[PDB]
Amino acid sequence: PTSDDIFEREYKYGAHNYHPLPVALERGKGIYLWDVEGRKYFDFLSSYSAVNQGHCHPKIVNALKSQVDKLTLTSRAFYNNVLGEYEEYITKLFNYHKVLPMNTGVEAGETACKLARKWGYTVKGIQKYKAKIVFAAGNFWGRTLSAISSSTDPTSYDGFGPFMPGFDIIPYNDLPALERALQDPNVAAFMVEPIQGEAGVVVPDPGYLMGVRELCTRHQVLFIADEIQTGLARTGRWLAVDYENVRPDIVLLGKALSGGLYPVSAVLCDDDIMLTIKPGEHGSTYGGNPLGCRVAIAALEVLEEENLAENADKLGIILRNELMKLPSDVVTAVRGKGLLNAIVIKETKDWDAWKVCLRLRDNGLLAKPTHGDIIRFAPPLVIKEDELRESIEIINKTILSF
Amino acid sequence: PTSDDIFEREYKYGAHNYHPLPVALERGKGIYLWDVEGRKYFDFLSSYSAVNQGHCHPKIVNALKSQVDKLTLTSRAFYNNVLGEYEEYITKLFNYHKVLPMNTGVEAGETACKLARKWGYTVKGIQKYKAKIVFAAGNFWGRTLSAISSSTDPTSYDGFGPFMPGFDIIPYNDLPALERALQDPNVAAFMVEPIQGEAGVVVPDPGYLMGVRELCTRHQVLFIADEIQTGLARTGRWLAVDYENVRPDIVLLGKALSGGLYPVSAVLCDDDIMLTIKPGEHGSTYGGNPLGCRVAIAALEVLEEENLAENADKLGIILRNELMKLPSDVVTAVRGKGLLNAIVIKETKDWDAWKVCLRLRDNGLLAKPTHGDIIRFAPPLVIKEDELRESIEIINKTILSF
């Protein structure tokens, strides 16, 4: 089974909704990935920041192994002995009254939208089905019809049919626009990434998140922080909103909540919001199952025990300082926080970000462009300074190779 | 670590979106569950048919244990060695050109709606954005904003903001209604469960599915079969539509696709539909990851080698025959196919379905009511005839003790 055999088999039998970088991995550990021919690569994508803990982290693997012989799925029609322990752990970790467990990032987002509308109708007092949710241009929170209904990316929404009403879009990093939107008392929530990941690591100006908090509070609007990609130590803090000391009304976690071992996502908020949803009014077959819950407890413990936020902070400072040494008639922008970083590749009609990632792959480093000309650099947070130095050398010699 | 500790902790720190049967499980094996006090129960819900293969089936556990050590998540920005093997396997198993992997059943349904809309615009010629999707009253396909927009159950949609446009609703088990609805040329698809599960195991009349297939073809409308619950041997066939030899345009699979070990779903269809979605136009972080694909291959293999379809066919006949022996004063209807079955209870001031289910629990059998008065009986398909008779005697004991 060769890489080309793998490419062709997927092309024949799988949908073509992805165009992946041509590399075929069969193993991963820590910061490293191996393809089927045995070549080794630095992972600088981390599955979009889902493997913050590194691939196949042994403590998470052992949690999964311990629970899978015991009990894996009851559905929430019954109780089991694991879900409560996890719920107590994660609500006490992030200091919210309650958690609503789901599986994928987009499901946590859908759940937040449902809580915001329910809260708007039953607490704020909006007349039924006039509630609005505001989003920021550039946002990505998944691919359901609701989620693409808030997207400004034509590839997400075009051809996918009438869109969800009550979803309004304002520019990112634009407080007066948010103030203007929040003039309308029918607005129930503003959902926003503290740093926009799929948009290309778009870091807003300092004080943006503080102003969001103050505007949402002043207008009695729920502040929903999507931290599915920025949370869990990726940017150098437990939540990226910790950089500004801001407390969202709802927090979304996913991705790294499981170390990549299991689709686990979380909706955290206080009772005044969460309990707007009554028994039978929301759910998911796999949401809150014992296996994902054991995996999630272990994944969070790893983030804490190994001090991965502080490592991400220090190493991100180093990586950004080395990337800013790149020439600028080639790299026109370097941005990021912690180990969520990007560069912007001045795309001639001679070379582009894709060619850059193909040559990075040839030199043993795996990264993928987004929105054409942006290259994200987002390695697992267990990377060491010497490993980061070697990877930076790969990046330098590749960029300069063009 | 008692049952009441468990109830109390979940009340404190978990969302209140379920009201579960008060039983606190900590182990499952095959058809059996054990609670934290050591009490043993027959599982007659099967996590809504996600554990068709029984709890903790060893072949699926070993598949998961074999992969969790190598590679669990690259995202589909890269290729991995497992996904294409699984795609070849499942597509040849069900005789469709391609599969689009997702994680949860609602995500497969959303994916199908997006396929149907995009096919309507790009193949059928419907003007953007006028494409409709027809659904049957009583349908249940998850809890996203889209899915509840097509629901006729007030508990799923009431209070949940404005609804998704372009969905029409007709009665179930009603070919003339479908015929009338498909006069509109802007209809792209009809999505329907071969047997409505959450609605209370509502079995359509013989020939309904043949007539659906005929009307969809006659009017150039996609037939989407949601077999997330009815598929994978549950009703005594690989797909419930196999009872009438009908081939939907799109098939949804979920739940038992992983034996309960991992959230895996799938959307199956031929090229002329599947390839209306181009690269970058749809995906999911965890969709198609190698861990889920290894468990899904093993879960399917279990269903084939242990002959669970024939088992559920024969044993479901035995179960329905014995449930029809119950008194028409208390049990007013019996229905089902294979091991997907339910009874309807005559509600009086001396018993209701919740009371019956609490007493079933006290007698060693776990079931949950749906829509008030319907009890579903759905044990794992690995159950044996003598175990099924023991369970039936627990049901007789319970019903006749009222």
Ligand SMILES: *[C@@H](c1c(COP(=O)(O)O)cnc(C)c1O)[C@@H]1C[C@@H](C(=O)O)CC1=N
């Ligand atoms: C994921 C993403 C989601 C959707 O999560 P899901 O894929 O488990 O449904 C929601 N919120 C955020 C902030 C993120 O990041 C990815 C973002 C994309 C990227 O290129 O960064 C691709 C996604 N799968």
Ligand SMILES: Cc1ncc(COP(=O)(O)O)c(/C=C2\CC(C(=O)O)=CC2=N)c1O
């Ligand atoms: C036919 C069908 N289609 C889609 C979904 C959504 O799947 P999901 O929960 O997102 O994985 C389900 C799940 C159901 C049904 C159910 C009950 O009471 O029967 C409780 C669930 N959570 C389903 O049965």
